[PDB]
Amino acid sequence: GQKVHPNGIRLGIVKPWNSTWFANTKEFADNLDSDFKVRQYLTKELAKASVSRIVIERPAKSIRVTIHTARPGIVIGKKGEDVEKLRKVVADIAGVPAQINIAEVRKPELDAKLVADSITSQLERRVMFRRAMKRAVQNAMRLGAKGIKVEVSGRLGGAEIARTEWYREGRVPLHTLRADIDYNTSEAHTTYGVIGVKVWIFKGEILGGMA
Amino acid sequence: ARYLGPKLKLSRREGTDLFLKSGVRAIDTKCKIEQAPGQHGARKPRLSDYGVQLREKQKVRRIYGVLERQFRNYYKEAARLKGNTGENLLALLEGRLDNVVYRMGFGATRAEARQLVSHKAIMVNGRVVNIASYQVSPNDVVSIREKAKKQSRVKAALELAEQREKPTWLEVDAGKMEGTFKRKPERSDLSADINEHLIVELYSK
């Protein structure tokens, strides 16, 4: 069958929104276009900075970006040079005065987006897909994830026939709404085509809800 | 007959040091001793039972400079002879005259020793012997004849032999340039890394 998006089905219940601002129908679409532009530019720039989650937050006359990243040192660089460059570019893109904040992810082995990006990086660098996915699963379980599942799909090892391979350890209850399933995907553009990577990480269950 | 190709190639393929060069310089400095020779040298394929047996036999043959027919004859004689077959085979290979000359130290390499023996530089009991495969007997004196006593390569080889570890089963006088073959080298005197079971099994298929 076809499974629902774990993040989308858990929005509001346990997962927050990435963009968090109010807008009337007059400015809704323009806000969406600008947010798309900002996220695209930021990912393209900080591809090698291990960025996990861009969070856009708009005061009525301001744009506040919050970059969740594993290595703040590289994104900020020398004192404030790189952040100021990013701030000025995002300001011109948005057309509004901008303010960039940086949140450090202390455990990049439990972040699904970072894990998927690392696997795709390894796949592009022509490692063995089983080796890469087993390393990711072992690292997450060692770091203490309640569960993790990783799936790779399409022309594995340059094979003419496409296949899907997946490894799960621990438990990853998808149907439990109150669970905390971090999920993200990535694509490795190998010389034989695209290889899709999906990662589920069950970190726990939030009883209190806490939206 | 004699292998005339690159010698470090054989050493790399086998993996160990076969002492195919004089030993003034490290074999790691002279070549990539770790990597196998060829386009696909970096890859290390897994060897099967027949592979390792063949490898061991090739190692011994390349070390001593013996082709398949002569080596097979050596094995046949060793099997026929009483006692341990592998030990007898090693004893015969040691008994070879070129090996004896190299052990005494009148040659930087076994090839150099064979060169001297072929070019009639070696007297055994006052008899000029020309065959490298000549089996030396116990209590045999082996001496360099006066024609070759002037060669500088013999003295350089003597210095290299002094550098090397001395064999107990021989007694060599460098001033006289002559050594006595006291006794057949025991298995304890011979190198431990060489395995004989593989050779015996390979030829006892």
Binding site: - | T85, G86, E87, H197, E201
Partner: protein
Amino acid sequence: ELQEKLIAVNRVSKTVKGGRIFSFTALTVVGDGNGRVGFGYGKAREVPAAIQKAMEKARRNMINVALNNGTLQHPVKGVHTGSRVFMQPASEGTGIIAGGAMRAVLEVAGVHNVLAKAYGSTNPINVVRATIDGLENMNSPEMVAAKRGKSVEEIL
């Protein structure tokens, strides 16, 4: 201390409603050289898991064999499903002359000189089991003297 070697890996199928499900079987033999030898057979969806399971099973369920100076004590026969096996105490220096699975089992067991031949079926699993059984059914001069109520000098 325990020397171990993998004899054979075989691919097998299950043929389920959807398609065919493949899995791997590993036959391994471990031994201490000093006389203890034990075989193991494992199965998993992947080769490394199967080999590790076989290694664990082989590490367990060992058996001691009475070795005389690194060789057998008397000619011994061994039988199983198809494998009929004969082994002879050859002289020192002959080496282990045996075919495949028997070679592996005897080498890890620690016997350095035997003359063996496998009659009948030569299926690796059955021949390993038959060889181990034959090694088990081999008594020493001390054992026969004790059971017969005599001294070793009377038995010779």
